[PDB]
Amino acid sequence: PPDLRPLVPLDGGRFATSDLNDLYRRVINRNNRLKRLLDLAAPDIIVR
Amino acid sequence: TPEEKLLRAIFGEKASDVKDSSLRVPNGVSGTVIDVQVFTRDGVEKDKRA
Amino acid sequence: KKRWYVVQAFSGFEGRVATSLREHIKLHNMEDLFGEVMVPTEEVVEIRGGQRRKSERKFFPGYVLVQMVMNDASWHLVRSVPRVMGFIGGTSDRPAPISDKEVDAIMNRLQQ
Amino acid sequence: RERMGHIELASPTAHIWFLKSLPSRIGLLLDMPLRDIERVLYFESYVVIEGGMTNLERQQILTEEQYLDALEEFGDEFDAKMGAEAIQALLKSMDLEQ
Amino acid sequence: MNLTELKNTPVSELITLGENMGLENLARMRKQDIIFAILKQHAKSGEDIFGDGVLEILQDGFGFLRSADSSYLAGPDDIYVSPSQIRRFNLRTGDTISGKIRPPKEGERYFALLKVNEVNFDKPENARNKILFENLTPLHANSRLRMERGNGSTEDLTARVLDLASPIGRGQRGLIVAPPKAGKTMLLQNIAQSIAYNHPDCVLMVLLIDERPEEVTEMQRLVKGEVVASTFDEPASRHVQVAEMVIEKAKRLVEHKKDVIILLDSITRLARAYNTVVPASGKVLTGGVDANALHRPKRFFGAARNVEEGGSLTIIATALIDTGSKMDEVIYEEFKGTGNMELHLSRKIAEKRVFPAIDYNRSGTRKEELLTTQEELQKMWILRKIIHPMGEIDAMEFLINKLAMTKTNDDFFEMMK
Amino acid sequence: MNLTELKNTPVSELITLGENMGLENLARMRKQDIIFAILKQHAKSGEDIFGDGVLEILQDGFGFLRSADSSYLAGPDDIYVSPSQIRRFNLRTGDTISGKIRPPKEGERYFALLKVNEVNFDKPENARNKILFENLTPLHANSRLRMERGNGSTEDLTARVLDLASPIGRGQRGLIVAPPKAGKTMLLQNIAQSIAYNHPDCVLMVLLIDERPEEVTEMQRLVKGEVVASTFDEPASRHVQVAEMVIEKAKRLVEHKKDVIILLDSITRLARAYNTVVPASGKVLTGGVDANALHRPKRFFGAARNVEEGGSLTIIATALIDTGSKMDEVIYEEFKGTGNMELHLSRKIAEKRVFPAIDYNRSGTRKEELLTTQEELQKMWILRKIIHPMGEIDAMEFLINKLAMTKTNDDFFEMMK
DNA sequence: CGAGCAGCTACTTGTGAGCGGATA
DNA sequence: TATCCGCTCACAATGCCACACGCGCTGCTCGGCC
RNA sequence: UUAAACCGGCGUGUGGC
Numbered sequence A: 001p002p003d004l005r006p007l008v009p010l011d012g013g014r015f016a017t018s019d020l021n022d023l024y025r026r027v028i029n030r031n032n033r034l035k036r037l038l039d040l041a042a043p044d045i046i047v048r
Numbered sequence B: 001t002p003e004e005k006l007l008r009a010i011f012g013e014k015a016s017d018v019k020d021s022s023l024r025v026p027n028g029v030s031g032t033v034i035d036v037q038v039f040t041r042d043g044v045e046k047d048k049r050a
Numbered sequence C: 001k002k003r004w005y006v007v008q009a010f011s012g013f014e015g016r017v018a019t020s021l022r023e024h025i026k027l028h029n030m031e032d033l034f035g036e037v038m039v040p041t042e043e044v045v046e047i048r049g050g051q052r053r054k055s056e057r058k059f060f061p062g063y064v065l066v067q068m069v070m071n072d073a074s075w076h077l078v079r080s081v082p083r084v085m086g087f088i089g090g091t092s093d094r095p096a097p098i099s100d101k102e103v104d105a106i107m108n109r110l111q112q
Numbered sequence D: 001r002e003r004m005g006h007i008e009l010a011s012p013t014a015h016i017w018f019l020k021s022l023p024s025r026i027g028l029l030l031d032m033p034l035r036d037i038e039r040v041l042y043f044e045s046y047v048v049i050e051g052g053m054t055n056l057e058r059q060q061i062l063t064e065e066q067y068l069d070a071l072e073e074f075g076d077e078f079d080a081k082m083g084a085e086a087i088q089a090l091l092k093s094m095d096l097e098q
Numbered sequence E, F: 001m002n003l004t005e006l007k008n009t010p011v012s013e014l015i016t017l018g019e020n021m022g023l024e025n026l027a028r029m030r031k032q033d034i035i036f037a038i039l040k041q042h043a044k045s046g047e048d049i050f051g052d053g054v055l056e057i058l059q060d061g062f063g064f065l066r067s068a069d070s071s072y073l074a075g076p077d078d079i080y081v082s083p084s085q086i087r088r089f090n091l092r093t094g095d096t097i098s099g100k101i102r103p104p105k106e107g108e109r110y111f112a113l114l115k116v117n118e119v120n121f122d123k124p125e126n127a128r129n130k131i132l133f134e135n136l137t138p139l140h141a142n143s144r145l146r147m148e149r150g151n152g153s154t155e156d157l158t159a160r161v162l163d164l165a166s167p168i169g170r171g172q173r174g175l176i177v178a179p180p181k182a183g184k185t186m187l188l189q190n191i192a193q194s195i196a197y198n199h200p201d202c203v204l205m206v207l208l209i210d211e212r213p214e215e216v217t218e219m220q221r222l223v224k225g226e227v228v229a230s231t232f233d234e235p236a237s238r239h240v241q242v243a244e245m246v247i248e249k250a251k252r253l254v255e256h257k258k259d260v261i262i263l264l265d266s267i268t269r270l271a272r273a274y275n276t277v278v279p280a281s282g283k284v285l286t287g288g289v290d291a292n293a294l295h296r297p298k299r300f301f302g303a304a305r306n307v308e309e310g311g312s313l314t315i316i317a318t319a320l321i322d323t324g325s326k327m328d329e330v331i332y333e334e335f336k337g338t339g340n341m342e343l344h345l346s347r348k349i350a351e352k353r354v355f356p357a358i359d360y361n362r363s364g365t366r367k368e369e370l371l372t373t374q375e376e377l378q379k380m381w382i383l384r385k386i387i388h389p390m391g392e393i394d395a396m397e398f399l400i401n402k403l404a405m406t407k408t409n410d411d412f413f414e415m416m417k
Numbered sequence G: 001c002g003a004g005c006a007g008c009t010a011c012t013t014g015t016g017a018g019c020g021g022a023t024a
Numbered sequence H: 001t002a003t004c005c006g007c008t009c010a011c012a013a014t015g016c017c018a019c020a021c022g023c024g025c026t027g028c029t030c031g032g033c034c
Numbered sequence I: 001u002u003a004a005a006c007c008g009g010c011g012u013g014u015g016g017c
């Protein structure tokens, strides 16, 4: 839940964040790329 | 709405300014100010105290 | 036979990684063993309409799979240039490339 | 705080807590040491399923050249999934009472 | 099926059709919401729906197929257009697209257009290989668009007077400068009716910006053609949206070598909206208008032009004066020099119940010799020579009396003899 | 190859040439975008392209080679000029430069000029060792530029009248004071045609600021020479850009000892743009014009001068009156005292269909004795003596009748006998 | 157009268990 | 083909308290469903 | 629908017991 991993308002581009958020970001990005790669008939080694 | 913008412009430069956003002394510490330091960014207008 | 071996690299500068790989080929005149880069990041939106024209001319995973008949000296060449994060493929480090059907697939991706 | 979401992954994934717990829970369940499962899950090796009329054993692992040379002997009846899908298939077709 | 095919008819037929589809109570939701639910059920029947609409491109790259009857605005039946179509054909704003659409799966937004079947009433092959609008060669009005009806009505004069004051043709840029309570509404009404009846070949596109909804309903179901409008019910955002959308539709239709008449009223409210939606440059002009507030209005105004290759775009935008303040007049000024066709209406004569009160003196057309034949031009020159030395009231009463005493314009020439 | 060599021809030949080059669908993008893609492919063939254009200097120090057919504006084929050329030769604004160019590598912007091969139709050695424009010695009009055509057309009179009202010569500073709907367009048209036909030695540079695009198309392909214009499609920024760019091109061409005629219409819209693009000084003048809003217009106006060493710059900028407000008239005032050549046109006579209606009374030229021979000057003095005591209508009808009854101007002198 | 990715160490020591392994 | 011997990795390392600071710049590429 | 009342996550360094 977001309340357990908050994003409090640190001014400017600098932001006071939790650690897990970057991992979730990377995981969702990789999952979206994998979902879009299978549809494009990507090379087998690339999807591997 | 255009009326709101023209109104806040003709009445100076005023908006939902009610934000306190002011620094006070921390609860528990007294003191007497003896020196003020202010530094402006290049381009920003310098107040009279600076 | 100049096979199409897939390699991952330090992303971000992937196009400049491809150009540096090409410079390293032409340095040791490695065009005998090697071919070209095939970076078909060529989703070619040009909606240059009102209020916005910055269209994404590039869309493809950060792989720059290069045509070459592989040699261990060639492997250490393609690893000698910087930004070669992963020379992927099922192996210790001497892999087998993608088949020819995916070569037709990447031709489709280039044409689109 | 109590309400949560989920992520639908297109590909299955193995839980690391049952992989490298020393001793592992999946390795002991499959009667296979950890090194082979590690090589299988990271696509440097394969693992076969539904052997049948073939000469190869089911629980064995294969490498890329082993999957290359063993593809021509049996094409249709031979099944060799790779990744977490192969592990899931092994777990699904694994009996317990027998 | 087609959304407009369900839109030409009132909410009653939509309600009974939804009852045929077996859904929740339809009359409760809005009629366009009714159409959304009805198309959802029709897609649930296992068939590919056929939709159509003009394209609106956002920053993300995808598109929306805004419908004609929805006043080219945001609606639940706006067909989503995947970016892949913009990659293949690169359909620009205003391109009337018709094709196959699918229902929105859950967590989606609207219907998605699968494959285009009709691009601007033409094959899709002409869409990619085509010469653009701002790429054309603008010219003057070569072909004349007559205005008189031909059966001699009382407001038929309101068309004849134009043909007697200053001709109107294809590709022209017309302004209507008039104060409030002068007679612009009925004027543009009979102008549209005469263009439609006498010249049914051209595409009549009447436009209405920030008027009464009763006026919109009177305009939509009185004249021939599509009637898109945006009253005061919509802010400056939707105003500029519908304006740019109809102007891009006209651009595409001229690119397809077709003539588009754009009767807009008024241009001053459009300029006010534009000045409302421009970023502040830290300075104001005389009257209270931003510096760059005129660039996009000037673009929208100069979009009209006559083309060498095919098609024309003729806009008649009404200018409003006697508003008390300066900024509107400023707009008028910034608009007298860009348009090559002026037409001025009188309120000082309209208060006398003297209609139609067109300013015969300050009306005129640039390159008007291409708008009328030789001897008719000689006779119009002599007629303006006769009209000049007499007073304003004199000229206007002479106009109204002797033209109501006539039936058609060439009959008027043959009676002045 | 040269961009203008691909620009003189329409988009159709560009499309088939791109099809020869084997690229994506060209008709979809703009024709100048077509030229950009075509030059990119031509450079891909392994050859150095030869480009040309006039230089525009930004604050960073590099330059842009704006092309003639692109109206001296920003385009995808604007050749980038590295600062090293400005360090070696110091090519100023308006210098027509031709040389070798390379394609833009990715992440770059446009083509880069490697080595200059032609500087203002001369060797590059004359570019560094040369006397500057504001460094010249201004003088009066010594050589007379005749205007009559010589075969006796109806609008040929429109040139003769000038030669009969006030002569025009090299290095002069001419104003055309006229209200709207007076006959300035056709006047400057036949003026340019007569200058080109009778005096093909001088460089005809017709200018157009904020007019109809149809007018721009009529001007470009009717007269001899380069026709750069900026209609209302461009804001005050691009207006002042094209203005300063053509004026600097004229400055450089006079520095190279060549004569440049600059027919501009109108100067009032240019002054409006200038007043739009000046910083506010916390005060306004009479009419609504900033204080320093006239400095740069005055510079642009006084750039014209006659030189002792070589070349001339003669500008004929049209002034606009009868606009209702003051500020424009203010401009006119601030411009009567700086120009040494006035020419006034009549609208009160133009409404009578009496063309051409030039104000013979308030027209004149300072130091006009250097603009015409001795006895012709005596005869013009006597002719103005004859024209003076009669009324305005009298003088004007006498002019038009007795000059249409003649064919040429010396024939007119020999007929008045 | 906005957001995310990315490019510009070597002395810890013990305790313990699991996994080759080698050696008959 | 069973039994020790050694290789390799995980897991751990008092608790509190107080104070203070720093958690970046710019270019590319991909995500597109208000 | 209306009225009243209320509305420090991490690392680092230092020091002390």
Ligand SMILES: Nc1ncnc2c1ncn2[C@@H]1O[C@H](COP(=O)(O)OP(=O)(O)O)[C@@H](O)[C@H]1O
Pocket: E366, E367, E368, E369, F155, F158, F178, F179, F180, F181, F182, F183, F184, F185, F186, F187, F355, F356
């Ligand atoms: N020399 C001329 N001969 C015939 N007609 C003319 C002449 N000069 C102007 N006109 C008339 O003037 C009209 C064009 O006016 P225009 O040049 O636009 O005026 P301005 O440019 O001063 O506003 C044309 O319709 C034309 O009939």
Ligand code: BEF
Pocket: F179, F180, F181, F182, F184, F320
């Ligand atoms: F009406 Be003109 F062009 F000044």
Ligand SMILES: [Mg+2]
Pocket: F183, F184, F185
């Ligand atoms: Mg004119």
